[PDB]
Amino acid sequence: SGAIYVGNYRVVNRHLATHNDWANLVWEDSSRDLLVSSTTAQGCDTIARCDCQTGVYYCSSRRKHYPVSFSKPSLIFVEASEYYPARYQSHLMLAVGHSEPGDCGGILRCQHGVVGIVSTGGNGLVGFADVRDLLWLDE
Numbered sequence: 001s002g003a004i005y006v007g008n009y010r011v012v013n014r015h016l017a018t019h020n021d022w023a024n025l026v027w028e029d030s031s032r033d034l035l036v037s038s039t040t041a042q043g044c045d046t047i048a049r050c051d052c053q054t055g056v057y058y059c060s061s062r063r064k065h066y067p068v069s070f071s072k073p074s075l076i077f078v079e080a081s082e083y084y085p086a087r088y089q090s091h092l093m094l095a096v097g098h099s100e101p102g103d104c105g106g107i108l109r110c111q112h113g114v115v116g117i118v119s120t121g122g123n124g125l126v127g128f129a130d131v132r133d134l135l136w137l138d139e
């Protein structure tokens, strides 16, 4: 689990969104596994605006942060789960690293700020849903 809080927005994995997230929906994209809901309180996470391919991610199944090299956001084939049939997920970044299903929502950060959140995994490869292109998160 996990979320990004920026301005009056909450960014979460779409497959983990709550009834409150859907009742205050701002934007959602099944192809990216992203959902953004509105908040009353103001968040102060910083979103990275860059093309960094190195960063650090939080892995809750190990209570540890790991440094990783990751690919640029792209369309990647993702196996079926209880939340989606087999499909291509867009804006996804892969790295060699550990993850388990409950790790979804852990933040990936570079020197510029928040890059994305864990969204997929398996076979020792972890995938992060990018948020750097969502320029509206700051206004």
Ligand SMILES: Cc1ncccc1CC(=O)N1CCC[C@H](C(N)=O)C1
Pocket: 015, 033, 078, 081, 083, 084, 089, 099, 100, 101, 102, 103, 104, 119, 120, 121, 122
């Ligand atoms: C994160 C993880 N790590 C290892 C094994 C398995 C997983 C879980 C995983 O990949 N999923 C399940 C939930 C929805 C995901 C999606 N965006 O389609 C795919």
Ligand SMILES: [Zn+2]
Pocket: 048, 049, 050, 051, 052, 110, 111, 112, 113
């Ligand atoms: Zn960066």
